Copies of this chain bind each other. A is one copy, B any other.
Amino acid sequence: SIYPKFRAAAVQAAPIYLNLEASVEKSCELIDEAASNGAKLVAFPEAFLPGYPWFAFIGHPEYTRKFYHELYKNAVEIPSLAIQKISEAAKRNETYVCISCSEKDGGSLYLAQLWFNPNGDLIGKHRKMRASVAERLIWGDGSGSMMPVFQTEIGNLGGLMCWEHQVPLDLMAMNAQNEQVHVASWPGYFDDEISSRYYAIATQTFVLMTSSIYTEEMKEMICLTQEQRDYFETFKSGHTCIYGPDGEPISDMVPAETEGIAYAEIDVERVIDYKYYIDPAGHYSNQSLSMNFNQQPTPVVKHLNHQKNEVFTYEDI
């Protein structure tokens, strides 16, 4: 393997709430801005296309149904027009890109992270392993066969998201792949400094805290009664910064409410210092403990030897 040095960027921003066709073009302006400064990797916050479902836990389970109907008509798909306009934006700048989506498959709905190469092609995708209490009635279940780490020109990339950082089995699974740089996206409400800072120590990587900001149109959309409106103002706002494998910040901190970007030098050769003290998947282990990591895909129904069909054209008959 090889140990590169490069500049990386992390973005604090918000979408045009529940509208996809504005939000994809806002991302194109914001990535051409980010890449203009020569950063080689760019990463966006949680659920950026089209937006995180705050309505799922301001109201009772019946209040959600009328908003879910408007989310479901604005989710993305693998061959969708929303992918072409990102794939061209990567191709025109020659940077690695990491973006978060809600995907529609087989009439069901999921949360995913999605990656693009400097040649413009889609490297792969990741699916949320389990939903937290706000999410469990909006989004579908995970899979164990969709937990990649990629060999690249810029070292071994990966990235969990959200509450996944509280589960030690996923820390071990990701560390078994020998990751080196790791994106971590948060919606904004959950308390996120302490768990992302522990993760940097536990697997010896750089990490990019990335998170979203609240805006005026989303509250005018989602509140209706006064005790929903003045209750929504209870939520804490997020922040974004990047950490070394020692657990201190290397970047500055983006101001705690405004839209903006942070960036720093990354010098991945420096990781070797900290692998001397500890390595959970190597020498710092015990023969009395193990882990079973199944990696085959098991869709609920499996097509074998998919084939097309024939038609008798009207000229024939």
Residues of A within 8 A of B (CB): 1, 3, 56-62, 64-66, 68-69, 72-73, 77-79, 83-84, 87, 91, 105-109, 119-124, 129-130, 133-134, 136-137, 139-145, 148, 163, 166-173, 175-176, 178, 191-192, 194-195, 197-198, 201-202, 247, 272-273, 275-307, 309, 311-314, 316-317
Contacts and interface: CB of A to CB of B under 8 A. Distances in A.
A160 to B, nearest CB: 13
A68 B317 contact: no
Interface SS of chain A: helix, strand, loop or mixed?
A: loop
Given A285-B141, A288-B287, A273 B68 contact: yes
Contacts of A300: 172, 176, 281-282, 285, 289-291
**Oligomer copy total:** 6
Most chain B Cβ neighbours within 10 Å, of A120, A142, A298, A301: A301
A209 to B, nearest CB: 14
Contact of A201 (B108, B191, B316): B191
17 contacts: A57-B62, A61-B134, A69-B272, A106-B178, A133-B137, A143-B287, A148-B309, A167-B280, A169-B280, A169-B291, A192-B247, A281-B301, A288-B294, A290-B298, A291-B292, A293-B302, A295-B307
Contacts of A301: 172-173, 176, 281, 290-293
A16 to B, nearest CB: 22
A133 B285 contact: no
B317 A140 contact: no
Contact of A65 (B66, B139, B276, B288): B276
B311 A123 contact: yes
A207 to B, nearest CB: 13
